[PDB]
Amino acid sequence: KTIVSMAVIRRLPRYHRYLEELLKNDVKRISSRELSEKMGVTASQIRQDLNNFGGGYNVEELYNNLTKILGLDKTYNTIIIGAGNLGQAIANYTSFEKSGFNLKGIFDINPRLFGLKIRDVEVMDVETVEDFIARNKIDIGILCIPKDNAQYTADRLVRAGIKAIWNFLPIDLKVPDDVILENVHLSDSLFTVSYRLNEEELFKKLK
Amino acid sequence: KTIVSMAVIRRLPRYHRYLEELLKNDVKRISSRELSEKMGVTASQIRQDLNNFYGYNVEELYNNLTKILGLDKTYNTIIIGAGNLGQAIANYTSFEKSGFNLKGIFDINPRLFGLKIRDVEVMDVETVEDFIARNKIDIGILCIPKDNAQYTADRLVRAGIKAIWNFLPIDLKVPDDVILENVHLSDSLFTVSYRLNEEELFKKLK
Ligand SMILES: NC(=O)C1=CN([C@@H]2O[C@H](COP(=O)(O)OP(=O)(O)OC[C@H]3O[C@@H](n4cnc5c(N)ncnc54)[C@H](O)[C@@H]3O)[C@@H](O)[C@H]2O)C=CC1
Ligand SMILES: NC(=O)C1=CN([C@@H]2O[C@H](COP(=O)(O)OP(=O)(O)OC[C@H]3O[C@@H](n4cnc5c(N)ncnc54)[C@H](O)[C@@H]3O)[C@@H](O)[C@H]2O)C=CC1
Ligand SMILES: C[As](C)(=O)[O-]
Numbered sequence: 259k260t261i262v263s264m265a266v267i268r269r270l271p272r273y274h275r276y277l278e279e280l281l282k283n284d285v286k287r288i289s290s291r292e293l294s295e296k297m298g299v300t301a302s303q304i305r306q307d308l309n310n311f312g313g314g315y316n317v318e319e320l321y322n323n324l325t326k327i328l329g330l331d332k333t334y335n336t337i338i339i340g341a342g343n344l345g346q347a348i349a350n351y352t353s354f355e356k357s358g359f360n361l362k363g364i365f366d367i368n369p370r371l372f373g374l375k376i377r378d379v380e381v382m383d384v385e386t387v388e389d390f391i392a393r394n395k396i397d398i399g400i401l402c403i404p405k406d407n408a409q410y411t412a413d414r415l416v417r418a419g420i421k422a423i424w425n426f427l428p429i430d431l432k433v434p435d436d437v438i439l440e441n442v443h444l445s446d447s448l449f450t451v452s453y454r455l456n457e458e459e460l461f462k463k464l465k
Numbered sequence: 466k467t468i469v470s471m472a473v474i475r476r477l478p479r480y481h482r483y484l485e486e487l488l489k490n491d492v493k494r495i496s497s498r499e500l501s502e503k504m505g506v507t508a509s510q511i512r513q514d515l516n517n518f519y520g521y522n523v524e525e526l527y528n529n530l531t532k533i534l535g536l537d538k539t540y541n542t543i544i545i546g547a548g549n550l551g552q553a554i555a556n557y558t559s560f561e562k563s564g565f566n567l568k569g570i571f572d573i574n575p576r577l578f579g580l581k582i583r584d585v586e587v588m589d590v591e592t593v594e595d596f597i598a599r600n601k602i603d604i605g606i607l608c609i610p611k612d613n614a615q616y617t618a619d620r621l622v623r624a625g626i627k628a629i630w631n632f633l634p635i636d637l638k639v640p641d642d643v644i645l646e647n648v649h650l651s652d653s654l655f656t657v658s659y660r661l662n663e664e665e666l667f668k669k670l671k
């Protein structure tokens with residue numbers, strides 16, 4: 259659990275992106291109202307969210323403060339487990355590196371892939387991962403393996419001292435309560451497309 | 466824009482995930498207290514979300530959410546970009562089970578044409594507009610590099626695609642009758658750096 263509610267926490271990266279978009283179009287200031295319009299959050303909720311962290315808005319300053327709030331002024335040592343399609347897609351997303359997420363190694367069970375170069379890292383045998391985590395002070399494990407007996411792999415990361423798991427698998431991983439588990443569900447985005455495709459009808463029906 | 470507000474709409478799939486899991490777990494009813502916990506939402510907010518459309522019957526609320534989300538219908542999708550991300554999306558069979566039937570995958574790379582993915586073969590993207598019209602495609606999933614991607618999205622739009630599910634970190638322009646949903650994995654990752662750094666943050670704030 260967290261000092262600030264997850265509901266607020268989950269809005270923070272969206273404010274951050276949107277302020278990045280304004281800072282990059284040289285927009286100097288933004289009102290509570292334009293900001294609320296764009297975010298679909300009430301102006302007063304946005305005030306409240308930001309009030310957790312100190313005292314319209316100067317774009318560059320709010321941006322910089324959100325960068326700080328989000329921990330993006332620090333470095334995280336990451337590894338990726340699973341060098342398949344998803345693992346390589348994530349590995350090649352160099353924008354995460356510019357935000358402080360330093361990819362230190364990538365691990366697979368498939369000898370076909372051992373030695374493959376992605377950016378500056380070589381795919382290594384997952385056999386050595388627990389050693390690697392402790393040798394390299396790894397903070398985050400990104401999990402992109404198939405789901406079968408995945409708990410076992412999770413357990414190996416946890417007992418090697420990982421601090422957080424960014425999990426793409428569609429199961430419930432069990433981790434101790436001190437370990438951060440963030441589960442990705444791309445369906446949550448996809449299902450808003452089906453919603454919007456059918457919303458007009460849906461309402462025809464209800465009335 | 467939408468009849469219901471986007472904030473409500475974005476919580477619906479998450480309600481549906483949780484109810485789905487209660488079902489698989491053979492749980493039948495669920496107090497609004499014990500529901501509201503997990504949602505980390507207020508029973509009162511859960512109430513007001515559903516209100517746009519003492520406890521809850523699990524299978525009932527679930528079926529209602531399936532219908533609200535349009536998940537009782539079937540959508541034909543294509544994938545543009547047969548690289549790492551497009552293949553990860555192609556092979557994720559849960560979407561299929563939810564009504565998202567993959568009809569075609571497209572690429573520019575002559576070395577991929579005919580490559581078999583699940584039950585689909587990779588085709589030249591030069592044929593994508595004919596495909597769309599021939600096959601009544603609803604949703605195009607963009608998994609290509611960023612340069613001149615706007616052109617590709619235009620092709621999909623001119624050809625009558627209804628929706629685009631965009632993974633590219635750029636702002637596409639589409640007309641007001643096309644749905645555009647942008648994915649940002651950073652919105653999930655940056656909550657991991659927030660949580661790891663939170664104690665430090667609040668020590669430094671005080
Ligand atoms: N969260 C979501 O919304 C989505 C989740 N996914 C999931 O992401 C995961 C990865 O997907 P893809 O890359 O398409 O699969 P893939 O088959 O391309 O890659 C999996 C890789 O993991 C390796 N692997 C298997 N067991 C391993 C182990 N114990 N340790 C290290 N490596 C191991 C395999 O050798 C393979 O290289 C799957 O679980 C998939 O279901 C995929 C798409 C969307
Ligand atoms: N939204 C997010 O959070 C994330 C976004 N991405 C993005 O998704 C995209 C795909 O990434 P990867 O699959 O790793 O890249 P990739 O380079 O592995 O694959 C791209 C594929 O697209 C093909 N291609 C290029 N232009 C095309 C066009 N006009 N039509 C059809 N095919 C075309 C190429 O031949 C190649 O097969 C990239 O833009 C990447 O930055 C990746 C990870 C996370
Ligand atoms: C990403 As979750 C904790 O709502 O399964």
Ligand SMILES: C[As](C)(=O)[O-]
Nearest residue numbers: 272646647648649
């Ligand atoms: C997901 As968006 C329309 O705020 O870039």
Ligand SMILES: [Zn+2]
Nearest residue numbers: 384385386414
């Ligand atoms: Zn071993």
Ligand SMILES: [Zn+2]
Nearest residue numbers: 428429441443
């Ligand atoms: Zn889940």
Ligand SMILES: [Zn+2]
Nearest residue numbers: 429430483486
């Ligand atoms: Zn669960």
Ligand SMILES: [Zn+2]
Nearest residue numbers: 634635636647
């Ligand atoms: Zn964006």
Ligand SMILES: [Zn+2]
Nearest residue numbers: 276279635636
């Ligand atoms: Zn934007």
Ligand SMILES: [Zn+2]
Nearest residue numbers: 622640642643
């Ligand atoms: Zn049109």
